[PDB]
Amino acid sequence: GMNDRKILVAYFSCSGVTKAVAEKLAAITGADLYEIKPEVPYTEADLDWNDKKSRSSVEMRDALSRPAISGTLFHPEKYEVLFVGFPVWWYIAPTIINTFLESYDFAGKIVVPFATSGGSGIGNCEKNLHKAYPDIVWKDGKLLNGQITRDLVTEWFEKIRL
Ligand SMILES: Cc1cc2nc3c(=O)[nH]c(=O)nc-3n(C[C@H](O)[C@H](O)[C@H](O)COP(=O)(O)O)c2cc1C
Numbered sequence: 001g002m003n004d005r006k007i008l009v010a011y012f013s014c015s016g017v018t019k020a021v022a023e024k025l026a027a028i029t030g031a032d033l034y035e036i037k038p039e040v041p042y043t044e045a046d047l048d049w050n051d052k053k054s055r056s057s058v059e060m061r062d063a064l065s066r067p068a069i070s071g072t073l074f075h076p077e078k079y080e081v082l083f084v085g086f087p088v089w090w091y092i093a094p095t096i097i098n099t100f101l102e103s104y105d106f107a108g109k110i111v112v113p114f115a116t117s118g119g120s121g122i123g124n125c126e127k128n129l130h131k132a133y134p135d136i137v138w139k140d141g142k143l144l145n146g147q148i149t150r151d152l153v154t155e156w157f158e159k160i161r162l
Pocket residue numbers: 012013014015016017018019047048049056057086087088089090091092116117118119120121
């Protein structure tokens with residue numbers, strides 16, 4: 001279970017919703033936290049999904065976009081379980097999550113996705129990640145827009161056999 005693991009909760013958050021979820025997961029599980037920080041922070045304008053020319057619109061229609069991240073984990077291999085959280089952007093993971101997954105060799109490493117959203121599910125995000133990084137030990141993830149309890153998290157660990 002959660003006590004049986006060295007855990008890192010890594011997350012990307014622009015408006016703080018996913019950050020608050022990450023902090024709660026960490027509090028419950030006793031995990032360490034890592035903020036995936038962009039080298040160039042996203043502004044309000046950048047995040048305007050109604051503007052086809054906004055940074056986020058342009059990045060998200062480019063399958064090869066890789067926003068740069070500020071900083072590096074020194075000993076990521078010391079963590080046995082990595083949770084990776086993000087807002088849903090255009091039905092998938094933001095491409096900074098691709099930058100993150102490609103910054104380390106996560107082959108053979110247990111990764112559990114989580115997300116927040118304005119209504120869309122995490123399933124489409126997961127299927128795309130599963131195909132993009134087949135050598136990661138992906139465990140079933142969760143959309144976490146609701147109430148996160150210690151029972152929800154302990155069941156989750158049970159369901160994914162951690
Ligand atoms: C560029 C952009 C695209 C988004 N795309 C979706 C989407 O496809 N489906 C959805 O339900 N919400 C979408 N959202 C809403 C975010 O997923 C949601 O507001 C999230 O909780 C924000 O998390 P954050 O505060 O940690 O940045 C989008 C938000 C942005 C800024």
